[PDB]
């Protein structure tokens, strides 16, 4: 996260760390959506051009964290993966369309002050909140700068959803209805973006109607980080919710 | 469900330092 | 720089 701020304790209790076992490193962010299911971006687990194809046994999920590198004894919980499910129509060839994946955990994770699931939007949540100018929240342990460092604790930044033509006009990549983009325009002066290591983490919004946090987006892609005239792109969770339900209902 | 209600904010009626920025943008 | 995790987890 670039031009973000240190998160508060328990501010993002659905935040998940995807952690590679060996060599031990941060893989991506992710989200807790119930006691045995984690939501992330497909490209975190499968990206053939770079020969990325992680199996269940290649990683762990870490829940309840605040500190990036510390093992947070008595706070964080670490779970093993039972099975990974990638959207079968995820388009890794062209544009990361349908950049979404689920992971089922071996055992249910116990909720705590630090561990708690986020809600998923329904049609009206989406219709009500996913409007240009409405701000959402992105969190992660990724890079603080496009090039140079890394944070000691979880970072947070709030960013406004952007008009679809402006999103369109900022990139040569073909944009689909299953993506949205968020961020400040050069005129606004305020800054912020996701960056390397933030992938797969949540874009959330707090409904003013019921005071709950909903995950509207998944950090998907962009070009560099916090560049002027560029915007972060996010997977449209509500648009892929039929698949999410399908998988959870089936498995 | 209790989804989306944080034990250390919503459940105890505490606000974090920047959620109002969000609220303020929802028209 | 990642602190070692309890062996069990791995
Ligand atoms: C593995 C994909 C990588 C991913 C992804 C990112 O953007 N990628 C490049 C990309 C983008 C569009 C594409 C594509 C690949 O193939 C088809 O369309 C990601 C990324 C995510 C968000 C942002 C940003 N908000 N500025 C910045 C970066 N990166 C940190 C990588 C892990 C390298």
Nearest 5°: phi and psi at A188?
A: -75, -15
Taking alpha carbons only, the member of A24, A42, A218, A16 closest to residue A105 is A16
CATH number, domain of A112, equals 2.40.10.10
Do A99 and A163 belong together in one domain?
A: no
Instruction: Note whether A5 contacts B: Cβ–Cβ < 8 A.
Output: yes
Start-end of H helices in chain A:
123-129, 164-168, 241-250
Do A171 and A234 belong together in one domain?
A: yes
Determine the structural domain holding residue B13 and report its residue range.
Answer: 1-27
Taking alpha carbons only, the member of A219, A82, A32 closest to residue A139 is A219
Q: Answer whether A175's CB lies under 8 Å from A152's CB.
A: no
Alpha carbon distances (Å) from A97 to A94, A125, A231: 8, 22, 16
CA–CA dist B10, A212 (Å, integer): 8
Residue nearest to atom 25 of ligand 1 (CA): A232
Do A190 and A143 belong together in one domain?
A: yes
**Residue B17: both structure tokens together:** 């330092």
Q: Which residue among A221, A232, A235 is best mutated to probe the pocket of ligand 1, counting the most ligand atoms within 8 A of its Cβ? A: A221
Q: Answer whether A86's CB lies under 8 Å from A45's CB.
A: yes
CA of A217 to the centre of ligand 1 (A): 15
Do A188 and A93 belong together in one domain?
A: no
- Assign A84 to helix, strand or coil: strand
Minimum-distance CB partner of A206 among B2, B17, B19: B19
Residue A38 bridge partners (DSSP): A32, A103
Query: Beta strand A46-47 with A52-53: parallel, antiparallel or unpaired?
Result: antiparallel
Q: Answer whether B16's CB lies under 8 Å from A201's CB.
A: no
Do A36 and A113 belong together in one domain?
A: yes
Please give the tally of structural domains in chain A: 2
Alpha carbon distances (Å) from A156 to A129, A165, A204, B24: 19, 26, 11, 18
**Residue A201: both structure tokens together:** 């983490």
Order the strands of the A179-182 sheet from edge to edge: A5-6, A155-160, A135-140, A202-206, A213-221, A232-236, A179-182
Taking alpha carbons only, the member of A28, A5, A29 closest to residue A158 is A5
CATH number, domain of B18, equals 4.10.140.10
- Assign A185 to helix, strand or coil: coil
DSSP symbols for chain B = --TT--TTTGGGT---SSHHHHHHH--
What is the number of residues in chain B? 27
Partners of residue C4 in chain A, C-beta under 8 Å: 24, 71
Residue A80 bridge partners (DSSP): A60
Q: What is the stated resolution of the deposited model, in angstroms?
A: 1.8
Question: Please, which experimental method was used?
Answer: X-ray
Buried b (16+ CB within 10 A) or exposed e, A67-104: ebeebeeebbbbbebeebbbbeebebeebbbbbbbbbb
Residue nearest to atom 6 of ligand 1 (CA): A221
Residues in contact with B8: Cβ distance below 8 Å, sequence separation at least 6, in sequence order: A9, A10, A11, A13, A113, B14
Q: Answer whether A228's CB lies under 8 Å from A134's CB.
A: no
Taking the CA of residue A250 and the nearest CA in chain B, the distance in Å comes to 20
Do A33 and A85 belong together in one domain?
A: yes
Tell me A193's DSSP state.
B
Segment holding A214, helix H or strand E: strand A213-221
User: Where does residue A232 rank: exposed (0-12), middle (13-18), buried (19+ CB within 10 A)?
Assistant: buried
Determine the structural domain holding residue A231 and report its residue range.
Answer: 1-12+118-238
User: Where does residue B24 rank: exposed (0-12), middle (13-18), buried (19+ CB within 10 A)?
Assistant: exposed
CA–CA dist A191, A183 (Å, integer): 8
Instruction: Note whether A24 contacts C: Cβ–Cβ < 8 A.
Output: yes
Please give the tally of structural domains in chain B: 1
**Residue A72: both structure tokens together:** 């947070």
């Amino acid at each position: 996260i670039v031009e973000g701020s240190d998160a508060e304790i328990g501010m993002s209790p659905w935040q998940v760390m995807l952690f590679r076992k060996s060599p031990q490193e941060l893989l991506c962010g992710a989200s807790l959506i119930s006691d045995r299911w984690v939501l992330t971006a497909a490209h975190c687990l499968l990206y053939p051009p770079w020969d990325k194809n992680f199996t269940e046994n290649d990683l762990l999920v870490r829940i309840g964290k605040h500190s990036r590198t510390r093992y947070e004894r008595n706070i964080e919980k670490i779970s093993m993966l039972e099975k990974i499910y990638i959207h079968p129509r995820y388009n890794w060839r062209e544009n990361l369309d349908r950049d979404i994946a689920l992971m089922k955990l071996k055992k249910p994770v116990a909720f705590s002050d630090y561990i708690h699931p986020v809600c998923l939007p329904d049609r009206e949540t989406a219709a009500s909140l996913l409007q240009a100018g409405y701000k959402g929240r992105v969190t992660g342990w990724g890079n603080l700068k496009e090039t140079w460092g890394q944070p000691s604790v979880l970072q947070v930044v709030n960013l406004p959803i952007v008009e679809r033509p402006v999103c369109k006009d900022s990139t040569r990549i073909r944009i689909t209805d299953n993506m949205f983009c968020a961020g400040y325009k050069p005129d606004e002066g305020k800054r912020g973006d996701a960056c390397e290591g933030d992938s797969g983490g949540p874009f959330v919004m707090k409904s003013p109607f019921n005071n709950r946090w909903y995950q509207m987006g998944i950090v998907s892609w962009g070009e560099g980080c916090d560049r002027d005239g560029k915007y972060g792109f996010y997977t449209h969770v509500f648009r892929l919710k039929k698949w999410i339900q399908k998988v959870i209902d089936q498995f | 469900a209790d989804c989306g209600l944080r034990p250390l904010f919503e459940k105890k009626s505490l606000e974090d330092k920047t959620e109002r920025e969000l609220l303020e943008s929802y028209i | 720089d990642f602190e070692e995790i309890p062996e069990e987890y791995l």
